Amino acid sequence: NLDIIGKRIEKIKQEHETSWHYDQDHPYKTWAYHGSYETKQTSSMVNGVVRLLTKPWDIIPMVTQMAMTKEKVDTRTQEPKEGTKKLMKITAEWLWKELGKKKTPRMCTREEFTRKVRSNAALGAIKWKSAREAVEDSGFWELVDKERNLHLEGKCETCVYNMMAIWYMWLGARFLEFEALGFLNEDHWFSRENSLSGVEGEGLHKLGYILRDVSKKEGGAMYADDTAGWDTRITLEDLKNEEMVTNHMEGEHKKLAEAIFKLTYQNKVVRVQRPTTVMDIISRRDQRGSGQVVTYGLNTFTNMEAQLIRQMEGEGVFKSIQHLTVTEEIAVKNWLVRVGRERLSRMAISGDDCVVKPLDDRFASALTALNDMGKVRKDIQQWEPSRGWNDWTQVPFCSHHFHELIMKDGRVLVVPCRNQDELIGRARISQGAGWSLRETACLGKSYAQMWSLMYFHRRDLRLAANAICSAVPSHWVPTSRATHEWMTTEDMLTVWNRVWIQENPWMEDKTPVESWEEIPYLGKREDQWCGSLIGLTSRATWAKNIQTAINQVRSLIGNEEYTDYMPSMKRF
């Protein structure tokens, strides 16, 4: 409590000593409330290039509504039973060891962090305006040093969350989290090769092949239960099991990592704007409050742990979660040592998102440990058995399903897919404003090249992608604000051959493809089923008159070097 958070709280009061009021109509029951001060401050814009080249979608409500525009955060998960706590501690210990077998924890550097902000990544930050300026500035780094020495002392002053649910910190606090825990992401601890259940850095062009490899194992159905608000269901017990990564560390790193876990995770402080505008300073010891990248890695870890325990329950490794016997602890340990790795290989896990192919379908009704860890399944009654999938091409994972698509030469593509309304509606939105015509065009080109690489097998996206790349100057570089092989000025057929043939470990014959017409689509009915507008009069007019749309956008951007990509299609 206040011994660890006082300094942060005390500091904030003093900066707004001419506003501090301890309001008694504060909406908080779970969150600890400390005080309030005076504040007054705060949407998605449409990409006109993508929209002008996707006119049929102007009348599809699923597309157009995506561009318009709580009581989950203010909740508390109960303390798990003692047998649940033991299962979790034993499993967490074994899993950190397995992840650490071929990796060395290590500090991440200012140089690494500096290069990260100069290249623009979503670091979620807030004397300086841009984070680029601070990295260049040198007082900021003295500010970092002060906090750093404070962390070594066992104290914290400026590591405070701002809710808006995404929790931004000042860039200095992000540095210190990245210094301590950045190795998890930077050194690929959750790669499939090192974690077995993981998919970090794999790419959407690999996920479908990975699900198909899981399908090949003997077992029962494939289960893909989503958790109801995963971040809100992270217990202090989960935070303490995650902290055990510091047991693999040494020297300063160990102290710095212990400090982030103790001070910024296990005992948080947040400033939330309440319109009644006032800034409430509240605190809590549980729930997920980190950086989006460390959040990913620790969500993956705790999800792997929860799913191995659910598997153990389905195999009857333990009887009851209320209490674990000394023989049952022995059995859990022997299971992990004898089949732990095999059971990890039966899963694909990406943060909160999982697919499990258990040994058999007893897993479907193995609910006691899962419910008691507080990982309550979304949209199903607490004690109703999971509905599993019998076909790997039906299984949802990372917002996608995967099709098996056979090339005219017999080689097999496993391709990612989702409702086409979702793909078109996302490409039509630009995050933040201040965008030039050129920047908006380069974002449209990023979507177009992504569609050519991942969604080529959809007829409407190949056409629209060719149109947008025809409408945007040939040499303009794609921008943004997975592995992203579409972010390049190289020829998109050359990248396709590299990603789908040369570098594709499931493709034995490495014969290059010479043209886009060699590259197949879904079935006409599978395409429409997935949402193609084909067969519609509004769509055929768009395909027929596409050069007119292209020319409208060329006229707006002006007199530039353009390429006609439309003849890559045999029809044009």
Ligand X SMILES: C[C@H](N)c1ccc(NC(=O)C2CC2)cc1
- 534 lies in the binding site for ligand X (CB under 6 A): yes
- For 282-343, what is the HEC assignment? EEECCCCCCCHHHHHHHHHHHHHHHHHHHHHHHCCCCCCCCCCCHHHHHHHHHHHHHHHHHH
Task: Report the alpha-carbon distance of residue 487 to residue 449 in Å, rounded.
Answer: 8
- 394 lies in the binding site for Cl ion (CB under 5 A): yes
Which among 92-100, 157-165, 383-391, 557-565 is the span making contact with Cl ion, rule CB under 5 A?
383-391
Provide the minimum distance between the beta carbon of 529 and ligand X in the complex, in angstroms, as a whole number: 13
Q: Is residue 323 annotated as involved in ligand binding?
A: no
Residues near Zn ion, by CB under 5 A: 147, 156, 159, 417, 530
Taking CB within 5 to 8 Å according to partner kind, which of Cl ion, ligand X, Zn ion, none is near residue 535? ligand X
SS3 278: strand
Minimum CB distance to Cl ion smaller for 44 or for 215: 215
The residue number with the shortest CB distance to ligand X is 534
- 524 lies in the binding site for ligand X (CB under 6 A): yes
Q: 292 to each of 279, 351, 398, 562, how far by Cα in Å?
A: 23, 10, 16, 38
Cα three-residue angle 122-125-131, rounded to 5 degrees: 90
Our CA dihedral for 86, 92, 93, 94, rounded to 10 degrees, sits at: 110
SS3 196: coil
Give the contact letters, 431-460, x = binds to ligand X (CB under 6 A), - = no: ----------------------------x-
Q: Is residue 352 annotated as involved in ligand binding?
A: yes
Taking CB within 5 to 8 Å according to partner kind, which of ligand X, Cl ion, Zn ion, none is near residue 12? none
Instruction: Provide the residue type at 111 as one letter.
Output: E
Task: Report the alpha-carbon distance of residue 357 to residue 311 in Å, rounded.
Answer: 9
Q: What is the CA radius of gyration of the chain?
A: 26
Beta bridge partners of 268: 284
Minimum CB distance to Zn ion smaller for 449 or for 532: 532
Instruction: Provide the residue type at 26 as one letter.
Output: H
- 567 lies in the binding site for ligand X (CB under 6 A): no
The structure tokens listed for 462 are 């190949």
CB 268 within 8 A of CB 257: no
Task: Report the alpha-carbon distance of residue 307 to residue 332 in Å, rounded.
Answer: 14
Which among 58-66, 381-389, 429-437, 454-462 is the span making contact with Cl ion, rule CB under 5 A?
381-389
Q: Is residue 58 annotated as involved in ligand binding?
A: no
Q: 223 to each of 219, 302, 361, 364, 378, how far by Cα in Å?
A: 11, 17, 9, 8, 13
Q: Is residue 147 annotated as involved in ligand binding?
A: yes
Instruction: Provide the residue type at 496 as one letter.
Output: W
- 390 lies in the binding site for Cl ion (CB under 5 A): yes
Provide the minimum distance between the beta carbon of 83 and Zn ion in the complex, in angstroms, as a whole number: 35
Minimum CB distance to Zn ion smaller for 173 or for 543: 173
Taking CB within 5 to 8 Å according to partner kind, which of ligand X, Zn ion, Cl ion, none is near residue 156? Zn ion
Which residue of 23, 137, 360, 391 would you call a contact of Cl ion, by CB under 5 A? 391
- 523 lies in the binding site for ligand X (CB under 6 A): no
- 517 lies in the binding site for Cl ion (CB under 5 A): no
Q: Is residue 542 annotated as involved in ligand binding?
A: no
Q: Which long-range contacts (CB under 8 A, 24 or more apart) does 112-117 make?
A: 112/178, 112/182, 112/186, 113/175, 113/178, 113/179, 113/182, 116/178, 117/171
Q: Is residue 403 annotated as involved in ligand binding?
A: yes
Q: How many CB atoms neighbour CB 546 within 10 A?
A: 21
Provide the minimum distance between the beta carbon of 521 and ligand X in the complex, in angstroms, as a whole number: 6
- 535 lies in the binding site for ligand X (CB under 6 A): yes
Taking CB within 5 to 8 Å according to partner kind, which of ligand X, Cl ion, Zn ion, none is near residue 495? none
DSSP code string of 22-83:
--SS---SSSEEEEEEE-----PEE-HHHHHT-GGGGG-HHHHHTT----SSS--PPPPPHH
Q: Is residue 230 annotated as involved in ligand binding?
A: yes
Minimum CB distance to Zn ion smaller for 140 or for 335: 140
CB 211 within 8 A of CB 348: yes
Q: Is residue 151 annotated as involved in ligand binding?
A: yes
- 566 lies in the binding site for ligand X (CB under 6 A): no
Taking CB within 5 to 8 Å according to partner kind, which of ligand X, Cl ion, Zn ion, none is near residue 530? Zn ion
Q: Is residue 400 annotated as involved in ligand binding?
A: no
- 380 lies in the binding site for ligand X (CB under 6 A): no
Q: Is residue 484 annotated as involved in ligand binding?
A: no
Residue ranges of the binding site: 147, 151, 156, 159, 226-227, 229-231, 299, 352-353, 378, 401, 403, 417, 530
Residues near Cl ion (CB under 5 A): 389-391, 394
Annotated binding-site ranges for Mg(2+): 226-227, 352-353
Q: Can you say which residues are annotated as belonging to the binding site for Zn(2+)?
A: 147, 151, 156, 159, 401, 403, 417, 530
List the binding residues for CTP. Answer: 229-231, 299, 378
Q: Which residues would be at the binding site for ligand X (CB under 6 A)?
A: 459, 521, 524, 534-535, 571
